[PDB]
Amino acid sequence: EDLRLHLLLNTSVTCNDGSPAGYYLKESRGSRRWLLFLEGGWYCFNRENCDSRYDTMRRLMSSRDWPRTRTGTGILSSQPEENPYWWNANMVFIPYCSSDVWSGASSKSEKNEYAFMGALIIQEVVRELLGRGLSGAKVLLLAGSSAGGTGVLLNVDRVAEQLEKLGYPAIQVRGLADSGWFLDNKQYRHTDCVDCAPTEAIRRGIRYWNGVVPERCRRQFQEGEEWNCFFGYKVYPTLRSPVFVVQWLFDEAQLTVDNVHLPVQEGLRLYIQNLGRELRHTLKDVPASFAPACLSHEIIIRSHWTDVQVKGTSLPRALHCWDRSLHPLKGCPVHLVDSCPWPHCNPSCPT
Numbered sequence: 539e540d541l542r543l544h545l546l547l548n549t550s551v552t553c554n555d556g557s558p559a560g561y562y563l564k565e566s567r568g569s570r571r572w573l574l575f576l577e578g579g580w581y582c583f584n585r586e587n588c589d590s591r592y593d594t595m596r597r598l599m600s601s602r603d604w605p606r607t608r609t610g611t612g613i614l615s616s617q618p619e620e621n622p623y624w625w626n627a628n629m630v631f632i633p634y635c636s637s638d639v640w641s642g643a644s645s646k647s648e649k650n651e652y653a654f655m656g657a658l659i660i661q662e663v664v665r666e667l668l669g670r671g672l673s674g675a676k677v678l679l680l681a682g683s684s685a686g687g688t689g690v691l692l693n694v695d696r697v698a699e700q701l702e703k704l705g706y707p708a709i710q711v712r713g714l715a716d717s718g719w720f721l722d723n724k725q726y727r728h729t730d731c732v733d734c735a736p737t738e739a740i741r742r743g744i745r746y747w748n749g750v751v752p753e754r755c756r757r758q759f760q761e762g763e764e765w766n767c768f769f770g771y772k773v774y775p776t777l778r779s780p781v782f783v784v785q786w787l788f789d790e791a792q793l794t795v796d797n798v799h800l801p802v803q804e805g806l807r808l809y810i811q812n813l814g815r816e817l818r819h820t821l822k823d824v825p826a827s828f829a830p831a832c833l834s835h836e837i838i839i840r841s842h843w844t845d846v847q848v849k850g851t852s853l854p855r856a857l858h859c860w861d862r863s864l865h866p867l868k869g870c871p872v873h874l875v876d877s878c879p880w881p882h883c884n885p886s887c888p889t
C-alpha cells in the first residue's frame with residue numbers, strides 16, 4: 539500500500555537547494571479524514587554546517603534523488619492490523635527538505651546560498667490538496683515526529699487560519715506532536731555541544747532562515763526572543779487548535795543535547811531522575827498526552843508502534859479516545875503520563 543510522489547506545481551516553493559518540494563499521497567475515496575505527517579531530522583543554522591549536511595544528508599536538502607513511492611508505516615499504514623487508529627484515512631507524508639524545523643520563509647537569492655521554506659511548504663501542500671479531495675474533509679490531523687513534532691506546534695494554528703481564510707470553515711484542524719517537546723534545561727556537562735546549545739542554535743537559525751512562529755506566542759515573547767516558541771511547554775498554552783502530545787520521558791535527543799551518554803553514579807542518577815520529573819511536570823496541564831518512562835528515539839511511524847502501553851492503554855487506543863472526546867469517558871482515557879522515575883520502569887518500553 540504505497541504513497542505516490544507529487545512535486546509541488548508551484549515550483550518556487552523549494553527545498554534547500556532550490557529543487558521543488560513535494561508530498562507523497564495515498565487517497566481513500568470513502569474517507570473524510572486526512573492525515574498530513576511532517577518528517578523530522580535535526581536542522582542546520584549557518585553556511586558551514588548546512589554545507590556539511592548537503593554532502594552526507596542530501597535527501598534532507600533536495601528532492602533530486604527522491605523515490606517515486608514510499609510505503610506507509612505505523613500511523614501511516616492502511617492495514618488495520620498495523621494501524622488500529624486511522625487505517626482508512628487519506629494519507630500524506632511531507633518530506634523534510636528545508637532544515638529549519640518547518641519554520642522558514644526565505645528563498646534562495648543572490649544573498650542566500652540556500653532556501654529555507656518549511657512554513658511555506660506546509661501552506662502550499664494544503665492548497666494543492668484542496669483540489670484533490672481535501673475540500674471535502676471533516677478532520678485534518680497535522681502530525682509529525684522529532685523536528686517534525688516541533689513543526690506541528692509551530693504550524694497547526696496557521697493551517698487552521700489558512701483554511702478559514704480560503705473559505706473552508708467546516709474542516710476541523712488538529713495536531714499530533716511526537717518527540718518534539720523539549721526542555722531548555724541545564725546540561726549534565728557544559729560547553730560541549732557541537733558546531734550549539736539548542737537555545738543559541740535556534741536563535742541563530744531564526745535569523746538565518748527568516749523563521750516564523752505562531753502569532754500569540756510571538757506577541758508574548760517579542761522581538762529577539764522568538765526562540766522561546768520552539769519549546770513545547772511555552773508555545774502549547776498559546777495554541778487554539780486541539781493538540782495531542784506524545785513524548786518519551788527520557789528522550790534520546792534530549793539526552794544528547796544535555797551531553798548525557800549511556801554503572802551510573804549519584805550525580806548522573808539525580809540528573810536523569812530530575813529530567814523525568816521536570817518533563818512530567820510540564821505535561822500536568824496537557825489533557826491529551828502519552829508519555830512513557832522509556833529511553834528511546836523510536837517514533838509513531840514505526841511498524842510496532844502499537845506495543846507500548848501506559849496504565850494498560852496503548853497509543854492507538856488513546857488517540858481513538860481523543861477522537862471520541864472531540865465529538866471524561868468511561869474506560870477511554872486520554873491523559874497517560876508515567877509516574878515511575880527511571881527508564882524502562884514501564885515493562886512495555888521498546889527493546
Ligand SMILES: *[C@@H]1O[C@H](CO)[C@@H](O)[C@H](O)[C@H]1NC(C)=O
Nearest residue numbers: 547548549550551658661662
Ligand atoms: C508560489 O508560492 C509563492 C510563495 O508562497 C507565492 O508568493 C506565489 O504567488 C506562488 N505562485 C503562484 C503562481 O501561485
Ligand SMILES: Cn1c(=O)c2[nH]cnc2n(C)c1=O
Nearest residue numbers: 639685688720736768791795
Ligand atoms: C534537538 N532539538 C532540540 O533540542 C530542540 N529544542 C527546541 N527545539 C528543538 N528541536 C527542534 C530539536 O530538534
